[PDB]
Write an enzyme that holds these catalytic residues in place. Structure first.
Site: not given
Ligand SMILES: O=C(O)[C@H]1CCCN1
Ligand SMILES: Cc1cc2nc3c(=O)[nH]c(=O)nc-3n(C[C@H](O)[C@H](O)[C@H](O)COP(=O)(O)OP(=O)(O)OC[C@H]3O[C@@H](n4cnc5c(N)ncnc54)[C@H](O)[C@@H]3O)c2cc1C
Ligand SMILES: O=C(O)[C@H]1CCCN1
Length: 1216
Positions: A793, A827
């Site tokens: 990812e 992200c």
């Molecule tokens: O920040 C977000 O949207 C969720 C998905 C990846 C980790 N926490």
């Protein structure tokens, strides 16, 4: 340095016994709340008989004495959509200020031809509101193509006369019914008629939810000017006979919240005091309206200071709303009555039921809280109301009760409860303008019940009244609403005069929760237990969290190389708080490359023993770990706050995400894994610093529960929370040999990835590091001669598109959250905001105003909105980007940083205005929002621009228009879509998270395909199937049959059936949201065949999953695919230069082991996305119909739609 958490969230004042009883009731179980209310609301049989008789008499009067819109619909034989479209056209025509200009347009242009050519903003922006008016039903989004067709049809059928009638109707409704007047002067002029009959007035200036300081100032000067006009008009009549004003505290400050309590008391309170001083001088009422449940107790601190302020003495006009649908209502009343006694002020107490019910249900579910702060059965609210009226009626010497209700049963109960002695000033009733007058004209006056009624009178322009009209319509328009039920002929008067107190008393379980409303813990039913959050508006919670956070900061946190044989020695250094490098959080001992290699060998040795733990028992370890994390949450919060730089709010959500991962992968395990689903072997889990517990736990838990031993390499920046996650997993029963912790830098990760016995890699982090890992793995094969699986990812360039139909205040709140929450270090964070040109300046102005209301600092204070970035190097990289943009002449908006930020690493939230999306050429992993503008006709090109970046992680769209939703969501290529809400905080099992292209390989974390990537033979996920068959696959199977390749044709048809392409599911989740999960084609799959039959099998797999293909021309197999049907040829290309013909979305490879290794390296050398590659030998293709697994040839898409965005929840209008 300041002590950690010494100032986390101190209350405004010490909580009195009375205040503590309020807080104690916040989320009290509903079965506990009702019995005392039933007792308090009990009345004699004689009184109940008299009340039922009075209620019947009122209802017979109401029913004895046809709306305008219904008459219009009837006269012109309008369909519902035609009626809605007509009202939207009328609304637009009324935006034309000059009457003669408007009438000329109607006569000369609208009536005769295309209205579309004469009226940047859809006519139908407010169609959900007009839909409620015409049909009584709420539809959250607007079918603007249906409405356009209906408007054309009705104009072509009936011409100018129907347009004129619609205009006149909308003009009356928006100027005289939804508001008393457009201006306070107009409203006052129209009030004399009913005042002469014995009504009074309180004017609602319709402001709320200030977003900027300028908004709050505008609402302030609006209130001030209205008080002058009302006070002049009152002309000495006093607070009971004469008119007053109502205010909403959310209108007067842009950060009206418990988290900002100090700013509220310092900045909001003096504004209310100044308005109250003016109200006192004119001797008029000034009422504080009640809003969301998490603002109730904060508002009490303002009420307290105001009533104790000697500058306001002599005036009894201060008023305050309490909401009887709230569990705290009687305890709030106890507090108010005592405050009235202490201050000697006769507080005007307006008892209402409450206006925000469906929003309170959604909010508690979203936040995973213990229970609701409101009742869930409407009859419980009714009993509460009557119980609280009894309390108020016993205290009329010290408060002035004001019973606001349109319910004739509620009214009659209180009228008889109050007894025979009455005088003006003892108590009053209240009702809404344009809604309650039919009922209260049977109440006011010596010829009726001779009790006064104050009319709550909205005042405002069309724009102002439309903003929250939906919420207002739902107050009286839901299935359980009195006004809706009295207009329903299928409801008898006997049903309407039913006594809620006695009905509740005789229930088998008194006070039971509504059967159709899930407690937040029970959102997923039997599948798994929802994680639980914490209410940061609850003073008891804040007090206990403060101590737990302080205690967490006194702990000597450590992280060690935890090998199977025990802790290992290594180089030790401290871990520093990113918000203040003086604050040492703990100590990490980092792993030598030798011990990293040793750890992989130990994990290989121990792999059979862990695989032999049955899947149900491995899942039981995960469930045990989830319980431990839930119990440890306050301490985990403290560590995440100090080690990772997060706010308490974001740390709570992160611990929830970790808990959810554990329970979700446990349940998915119990649904799927059997003896044939063998583990890969040792899996290396490399986790990032931005989710140092949640993604750390998620990757590890999935690999463990799939039967693989794990080597856990946490981010160099955040080892301590990783070590704690490992302690918890080991305490839950994961053996030390199954879960080894290897703290350190990227050399440790690289040593682990390169180790011969590493059977799989799970990476979340940067694209560049993922690409380096991919190149490492391409050197290796499994013992079976197959590629080492990589789940990588890798972020995104996430956009949000906003058109002119979106509500600016909603957009700005969702943008501020999406872009600057967690310092933009998600992200999923919003990187590019795309604003339709016509609304871009207004939204940008509001966005910049909201930006400057953010508090940046060390995150051990609840008031901090944005914390530090993770390192000085992160800071320097982000700042270099900002200055590069500044140097290019782009407009840059930045908040000023306090001097205290200098001891940490902070980047101020930043807005950068770009000309085009292509101006942004690198992912900037910080609190930096880029803004571009677009013309509406270029929307499709803009979606191209977003897709062209090659990323595809999160994406947001704000629009009310179905055509725009359909268009954008069909053309965008991203894994996590969000409609009319923020784009962050993906919820495990609800928005399975993960994207495509440069954003990752998949499968999605927190989704049903995840575990299957971590075993050698994937199971069939729950609900994983599709009845749809790709038509190009079908044409290919027929071609194969025509060529005589009957075995491959059969294999092709089998792939067509086995494919889950077209899966389209709705996942369980909170109310007010629809969470959808769908399987699409990935795109163009690179086929590297060796044999004719292999190519046919590869093509069947790719086509069955909806993909196109690029076939390696160096295979020499062109002659195997002669005379393809055109449908298949359209999907087939041949590639000599794979790098030139990408990007690809996956690959299928056929060959022996060294051919596979060679092709794998060649694929890793392709620029762009990391391809999910599947390889098989010719013999495996012959032996195994599943040699190429169709799971990895489809693309998962999650879409979360905020269905409450129009102002309320249609589904919950049926729940009472
Ligand atoms: O920040 C977000 O949207 C969720 C998905 C990846 C980790 N926490
Ligand atoms: C003069 C006036 C002033 C007002 N001021 C405010 C204000 O400052 N703050 C505020 O929040 N609202 C305010 N309201 C709105 C009020 O709270 C009600 O929402 C609305 O008036 C309808 O309630 P009712 O007694 O008229 O009718 P009813 O049909 O008797 O009651 C409807 C109410 O029942 C409740 N309800 C519906 N379904 C459920 C359920 N499943 N479980 C539990 N309860 C349920 C809701 O509160 C709903 O509004 C005001 C209303 C008036 C007339
Ligand atoms: O990290 C550690 O060593 C243990 C002791 C302090 C809290 N957790």
């Amino acid at each position: 340095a300041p002590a950690p958490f010494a100032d986390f969230a101190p209350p405004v004042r010490p909580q009195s016994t009375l205040r503590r009883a309020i807080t104690a009731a916040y989320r009290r179980p509903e079965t506990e709340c009702l019995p005392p209310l039933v007792e308090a609301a009990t009345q004699s049989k004689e009184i109940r008989d008299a009340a039922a008789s009075t209620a019947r008499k009122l209802i017979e009067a109401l029913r004895g004495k046809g709306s305008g819109v219904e008459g219009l619909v009837q006269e012109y034989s309008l369909s519902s959509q035609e009626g809605v479209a007509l009202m939207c056209l009328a609304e637009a025509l009324l935006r034309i200020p000059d009457t003669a200009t408007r009438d000329a347009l109607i006569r000369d242009k609208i009536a005769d031809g295309n209205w579309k050519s004469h009226l940047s903003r859809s006519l139908f922006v407010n169609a959900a509101t007009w839909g409620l008016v015409v049909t009584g039903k709420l539809t959250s989004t607007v079918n603007d193509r249906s409405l356009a067709a209906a408007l054309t049809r009705l104009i072509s059928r009936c011409g100018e006369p129907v347009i004129r009638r619609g205009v006149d109707m909308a003009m009356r409704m928006m100027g005289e019914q939804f508001v008393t007047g457009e201006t306070i002067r107009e409203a006052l002029k129209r009030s004399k008629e009913l005042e002469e009959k014995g009504f009074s007035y309180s004017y609602d200036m319709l402001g709320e939810a200030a977003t900027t300081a300028a908004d709050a100032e505008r609402y302030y000067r609006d209130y001030e000017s209205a008080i002058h006009a009302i006070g002049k008009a009152s002309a000495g009549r006093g607070i009971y006979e004469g008119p007053g004003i109502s205010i909403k505290l959310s209108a007067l400050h842009p950060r009206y919240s418990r988290a900002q309590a100090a700013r509220v008391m310092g900045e909001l309170l003096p504004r209310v005091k100044a308005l109250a001083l003016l109200a006192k001088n004119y001797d008029i009422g000034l009422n504080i309206d009640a809003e969301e449940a998490d603002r109730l107790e904060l508002s009490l601190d303002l009420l307290e200071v105001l009533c104790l302020d000697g500058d306001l003495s002599g005036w009894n006009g201060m008023g305050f709303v309490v909401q009887a649908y709230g569990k705290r209502c009687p305890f709030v009343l106890d507090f108010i009555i005592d405050l009235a006694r202490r201050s000697g002020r006769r507080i005007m107490v307006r008892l209402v039921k409450g206006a925000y019910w469906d929003a309170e249900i959604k909010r508690a579910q979203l936040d995973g809280l213990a229970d609701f702060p409101v009742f869930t059965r409407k009859i419980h609210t009714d009993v509460s109301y009557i119980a609280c009226a009894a309390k108020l009626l016993a205290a009329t010497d010290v408060v002035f009760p004001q019973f606001a209700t349109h319910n004739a049963q509620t009214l009659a109960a209180i009228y008889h409860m109050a007894g025979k002695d009455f005088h003006v000033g003892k108590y009053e009733f209240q009702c809404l303008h344009g809604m309650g007058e039919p009922l209260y004209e049977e109440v006011v006056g010596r010829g009726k019940l001779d009790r006064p009624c104050r009319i709550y009178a909205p005042v405002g322009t069309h724009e102002t009244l439309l903003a929250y009209l939906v919420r207002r319509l739902l107050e009286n328009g839901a299935n359980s609403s009195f006004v809706h039920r009295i207009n329903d002929p299928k409801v008898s008067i006997d049903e309407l005069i039913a006594d809620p107190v006695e009905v509740v008393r005789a229930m088998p379980v008194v006070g039971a929760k509504h059967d159709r409303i899930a407690l937040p813990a029970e959102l997923f039913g039997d599948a798994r237990t929802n994680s639980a959050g914490l209410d940061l508006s609850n003073e008891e919670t804040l007090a206990s969290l403060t101590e737990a956070l302080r205690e967490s900061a006194a702990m000597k946190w450590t992280a060690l190389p935890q090998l199977a044989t025990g802790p290992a020695a290594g180089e030790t250094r401290t871990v520093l708080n990113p918000g203040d490098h003086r604050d040492v959080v703990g100590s990490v001992t980092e792993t030598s490359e030798e011990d990293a290699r040793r750890a992989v060998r130990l994990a290989a040795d121990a792999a059979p023993d862990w695989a032999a733990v049955p899947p149900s028992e491995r899942a039981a370890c995960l469930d045990r770990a989830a319980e431990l994390m839930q119990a440890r949450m306050p301490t985990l919060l403290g560590l995440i706050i100090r080690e990772a730089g997060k706010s308490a709010l974001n740390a709570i959500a992160e611990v929830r995400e970790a808990i959810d991962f554990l329970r979700y992968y446990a349940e998915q395990t119990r649904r799927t894994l059997g003896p044939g689903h063998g583990p890969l072997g040792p899996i290396v889990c490399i986790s990032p610093w931005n989710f140092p517990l949640a993604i750390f736990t998620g990757q590890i838990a999935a690999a463990l529960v799939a039967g693989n031993p794990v080597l856990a390499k946490p981010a160099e920046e955040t080892p301590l929370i990783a070590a704690e996650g490992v302690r918890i997993l080991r305490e839950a029963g994961i053996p030390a040999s199954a879960l080894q912790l290897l703290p350190g830098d990227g050399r440790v990760g690289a040593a682990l990835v390169a180790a011969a016995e590493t059977a799989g890699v799970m990476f979340t982090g940067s694209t560049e590091v993922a690409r380096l890992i991919q190149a490492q793995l391409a050197d290796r094969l499994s013992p079976a001669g197959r590629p080492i699986p990589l789940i990588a990812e890798t972020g995104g360039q996430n956009a949000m598109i906003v058109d002119s139909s979106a509500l600016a205040e909603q957009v700005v709140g969702d943008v501020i959250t999406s872009a600057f929450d967690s310092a933009g270090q998600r992200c999923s964070a919003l990187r590019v905001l795309c604003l339709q040109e016509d609304v871009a300046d207004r939204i940008l102005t509001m966005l910049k105003g909201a930006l400057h209301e953010l508090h940046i600092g060390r995150t051990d204070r609840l008031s901090v909105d944005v914390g530090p970035v993770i390192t000085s190097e992160a800071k320097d990289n982000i700042e270099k980007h900002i200055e590069r943009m500044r140097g290019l002449g782009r407009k840059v908006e930045q908040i000023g940083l306090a001097s205290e930020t200098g001891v940490g690493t902070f980047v101020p939230p930043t807005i950068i205005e770009l000309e085009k999306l292509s101006d942004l050429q690198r992912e900037v992993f910080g609190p930096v929002l880029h803004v571009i503008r677009y013309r509406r006709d270029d929307l499709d090109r803009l979606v191209d621009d977003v897709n062209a970046t090659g990323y595809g992680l999160t994406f947001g769209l704000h629009t009310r228009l179905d055509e725009t939703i359909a268009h954008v969501t069909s053309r965008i290529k991203a894994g996590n879509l969000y409609i009319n809400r923020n784009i962050i905080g993906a919820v495990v099992g609800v928005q399975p998270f993960g994207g495509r292209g440069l954003s990752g390989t998949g499968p999605k974390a927190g989704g049903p395909l995840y575990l299957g990537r971590l075993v050698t033979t994937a199971p069939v996920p729950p609900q994983h199937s599709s009845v749809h068959t790709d038509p190009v696959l079908l044409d290919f199977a027929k071609w194969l049959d025509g060529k005589g390749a009957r075995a491959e044709a059969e294999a092709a048809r089998n792939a067509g059936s086995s494919s889950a392409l077209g899966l389209d599911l709705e996942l369980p989740g909170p109310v007010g949201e629809r969470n959808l999960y769908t399987l699409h084609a990935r795109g163009r799959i690179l086929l590297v065949p060796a044999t004719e039959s292999g190519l046919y099998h590869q093509l069947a797999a790719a086509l069955a999953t909806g993909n196109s293909v690029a076939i390696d021309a160096a295979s020499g197999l062109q002659a195997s695919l002669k005379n393809l049907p055109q449908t298949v040829g359209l999907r087939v290309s041949w590639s000599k230069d794979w790098a030139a013909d990408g990007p690809f979305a996956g690959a299928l490879v056929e060959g022996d082991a060294e051919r596979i290794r060679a092709v794998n390296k060649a694929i890793a050398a392709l620029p762009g996305p990391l391809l999910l590659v599947q390889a098989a030998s010719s013999g495996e293709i012959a032996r195994n119909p599943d040699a190429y697994c169709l799971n990895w040839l489809v693309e998962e898409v999650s879409a979360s739609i905020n269905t409450a965005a129009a102002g309320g929840n249609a589904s919950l209008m049926a729940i009472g």
